[PDB]
Design a protein around this ligand. Structure first.
Ligand SMILES: C[S@@+](CC[C@H](N)C(=O)[O-])C[C@H]1O[C@@H](n2cnc3c(N)ncnc32)[C@H](O)[C@@H]1O
Ligand SMILES: C[S@@+](CC[C@H](N)C(=O)[O-])C[C@H]1O[C@@H](n2cnc3c(N)ncnc32)[C@H](O)[C@@H]1O
Lengths: 679, 74
């Protein structure tokens, strides 16, 4: 951000247009994941006892209101931009091309690698012996399996149904059961894949049934004709409403679908196109009328689904004893649909900027793409630090005088910059690069409008957006003390006008570069002793991922975290205008993760939530914290990031959700809530 | 096994005073914890012609302080 060179009224820099044979820009970045991580799912479970009449009418009002006023236009734009078949096609292509060359050996009969191979190729695969693939006969080239967008999702759903009944299974075979896929299935590839996958089994009957089915599937309409009997062990239903109807018609259609599926098999997975609290709870109520049988239901969402899809799957199975808590309220997987309210502004399309300006804030999020003369490269690189924290500079040939530059606009860098009027940079360091210090790369460069970030980065961005909205809503405030802030991570929320203070025992000290940007750093620890707590009358205090750990790198028990919360709450009393924000993992996420298999980085170890290679930390119970803050006597509030925060993060930052990250993001956000302690 | 066996009853478990008091502060009712004292011991031993024993004298001080009464009033 800062340097030893002082700029003033510097002339702007124009980047010339680069040919399409040197720099090419794509829309959505493909994502690379291990083959075993395509088949995941995350559980969500009901947490309510009764469905009273006032709740019924309010939920109906909240649901019908979001039908005519369709889902947010920005979410619709991202959902159809980031598909799933394209988001993982290179992996399947790699598998198929490896298979054809004769490089596929030593995989288990029913492993997920075998299932992926059955989805990647068309021909039948035989085992010359257990745990080895027979080489294909000479002269045989099998065409790659042409599957649609919703095929890998069906494979993951089949895996989930084959995994719920036995959580310790390592193979997925159905001897000698049967299954049917309730789906229109114009040209169903999943039936072919599953038939090719269970061939060694003695006899399993699997087939699709739907409205527009072709051979070998059967063309029927749901509910089934009265003069026919259908019966199977598994149901994987996903029925869509292509035509436009009212709320009542889709209600009746989905009620009939759920009843028929639940009466057709011992286990069923049914897709809900419009998952609302009222709709899901009405489905739950109708489940009880099915002959007085007790049904156990839990919301599900696979890891091979469209990351931005608000559609969630329901799971239905009979249970010996009726579940005490059958109803859902403010669940993780419904709040992606509730909070997807139509926008008050048009979606912002990322753009390419070709002109570099000196301290000019007229830049929308996007990329800096262009080429400049080698002599102006240090100057342009010194002037674009005010917007971007990274830049990839390279040259084509040593006989070429122009230098190609790519850089992404970073809102955190904008927030840290522009806090003052001073313009300093290490322009003296960059002139050491001319002319051969800027790299060479003959090959074409491929950069994406929406790059990839891990799940925790997405969550932090959404929570920062939420806190920034909250802080901007208030008024008459002097500073924002970031207790947990390390390396100025929380600066994305503080307004440029007001101060910002960091109290972290481990942070770099450089007094001049912190004076030049109006920040103050205190490398002393934050003592949670209400007698010595240094809370200004008019300030905002941020506690982000700091309560849950120790500054030396250790984890803290739940009672210590509760004591810290109590200390900050009590010491925050006897103040005029004080606001504090605290975040903590909740105890409801342990129940969901220990039943699921989509855990990639957010994992559970011995009851402590192992998140992103950090030490395993225990969770807190919402009821206990709420009771403690009720007894203390301060105005508390549990707030969680929602869909608009996700959209704003993924739009300002040119980053999009991953295939595996989409399933876990619903649950993760609901169980890392934020406390708003105000006066 | 962590329970109180009194008068050959079925052993029963014990409540924490902090939890009980904390519960009544949220509910919103006036509450108090009352305990019998030495004058109550004298009155029981005078109005009824009874006296303490040897094994009962030592244990009764502990028995009083941990069998309290909650006086909820409006
Ligand atoms: C998602 S589309 C099918 C897309 C593709 N075949 C696939 O594998 O997902 C859902 C299908 O369900 C069928 N469908 C719609 N309403 C139905 C109903 N009421 N009863 C039975 N099938 C229905 C439609 O024909 C439609 O093709
Ligand atoms: C998990 S990081 C959180 C980073 C940042 N707060 C954020 O937005 O996520 C927590 C950091 O806070 C620091 N820290 C731990 N205890 C602290 C305390 N009691 N007071 C101030 N800082 C602390 C630690 O050095 C640790 O690196």
């Amino acid at each position: 951000v800062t340097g030893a060179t002082e700029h003033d009224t510097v002339a702007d820099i124009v980047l010339g247009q680069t040919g399409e044979d040197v720099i090419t820009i794509s829309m959505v970045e493909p994502m690379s994941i291990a083959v075993e991580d395509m088949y995941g799912y995350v559980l969500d479970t009901p947490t309510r006892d009764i469905w009273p009449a006032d709740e019924q009418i309010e939920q109906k009002g909240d649901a019908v209101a979001l039908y005519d006023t369709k889902t947010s236009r920005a979410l619709g734009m991202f959902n159809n931009t980031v598909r799933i078949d394209d988001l993982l096609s290179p992996l399947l292509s790699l598998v198929y091309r490896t298979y054809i060359k004769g490089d596929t050996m030593t995989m288990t009969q029913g492993s997920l690698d075998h299932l992926t191979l059955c989805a990647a190729v068309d021909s039948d695969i035989t085992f010359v012996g257990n745990r080895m693939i027979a080489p294909l006969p000479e002269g045989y080239i099998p065409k790659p399996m042409h599957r649609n967008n919703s095929t890998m999702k069906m494979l993951s759903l089949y895996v989930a149904l084959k995994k719920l009944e036995n959580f310790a299974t390592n193979s997925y075979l159905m001897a000698p059961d049967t299954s049917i896929i309730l789906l229109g299935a114009e040209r169903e590839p999943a039936v072919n894949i599953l038939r090719r996958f269970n061939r060694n089994v003695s006899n399993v009957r699997i087939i699709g049934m739907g409205d527009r089915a072709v051979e070998p599937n059967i063309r029927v309409r749901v509910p089934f004709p009265i003069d026919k009997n259908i019966s199977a062990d598994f149901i994987i239903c996903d029925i869509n409403s292509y035509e436009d109807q009212s709320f009542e018609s889709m209600f009746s259609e989905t009620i009939s679908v759920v009843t028929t599926c639940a009466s057709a098999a011992t286990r069923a997975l049914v897709k809900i196109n419009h998952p609302s609290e009222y709709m899901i709870n009405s489905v739950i109520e109708r489940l009880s009328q099915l002959g007085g049988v007790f049904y156990h239901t839990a919301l599900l969402k696979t890891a091979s689904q469209n990351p931005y899809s608000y559609e969630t799957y329901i799971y239905i199975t009979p249970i010996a004893a009726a579940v005490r808590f059958p109803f859902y309220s403010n669940s993780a997987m419904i709040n992606r649909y509730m909070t997807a309210v139509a926008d008050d502004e048009m979606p912002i399309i990322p753009s390419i900027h070709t002109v570099i300006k000196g301290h000019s804030n007229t830049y929308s999020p996007g990329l800096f793409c262009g080429c400049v003369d080698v002599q102006s490269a240090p100057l342009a690189l010194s002037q674009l630090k005010s917007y971007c924290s990274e830049a990839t500079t390279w040259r084509v040939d040593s006989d070429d005088n122009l230098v190609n530059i790519i850089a992404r606009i970073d809102p955190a860098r904008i927030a840290l910059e522009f806090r003052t009027r001073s313009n300093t940079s290490a322009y003296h360091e960059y002139q050491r690069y001319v002319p051969n210090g800027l790299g060479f790369k003959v090959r074409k460069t491929r950069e994406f409008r929406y790059m990839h970030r891990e799940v925790t980065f997405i969550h932090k961005l959404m929570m920062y957006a939420l806190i920034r909205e909250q802080i901007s809503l208030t008024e008459n405030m002097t500073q924002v003390v970031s207790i947990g802030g390390r390396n100025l991570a929380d600066i994305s929320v503080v307004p440029l006008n007001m101060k910002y203070v960091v109290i972290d025992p481990a942070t770099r000290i450089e007094t001049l570069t912190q004076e030049k940007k109006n920040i103050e750093v205190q490398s002393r620890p934050f003592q949670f002793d209400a007698a010595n707590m240094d809370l200004e009358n008019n300030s905002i205090y941020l506690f982000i991922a700091v309560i849950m750990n120790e500054p030396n790198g250790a984890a803290t028990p739940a009672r210590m975290q509760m004591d810290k919360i109590r200390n900050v709450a009590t010491a925050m009393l006897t103040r005029t205008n004080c606001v504090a924000y605290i975040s903590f993992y909740e105890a409801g996420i342990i129940t969901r993760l220990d039943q699921s298999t989509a855990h990639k980085t957010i994992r559970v170890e011995e009851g402590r939530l192992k998140v992103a290679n950090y030490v395993p930390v225990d969770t807190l119970v919402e009821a206990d914290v709420t009771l403690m803050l009720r007894d203390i006597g301060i105005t508390h509030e549990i707030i969680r990031p929602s869909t608009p925060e996700l959209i704003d993060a993924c739009s300002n930052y040119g980053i999009r959700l991953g295939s595996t990250g989409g399933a876990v993001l619903d649950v993760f956000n609901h169980y890392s809530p934020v406390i708003k302690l105000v006066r």
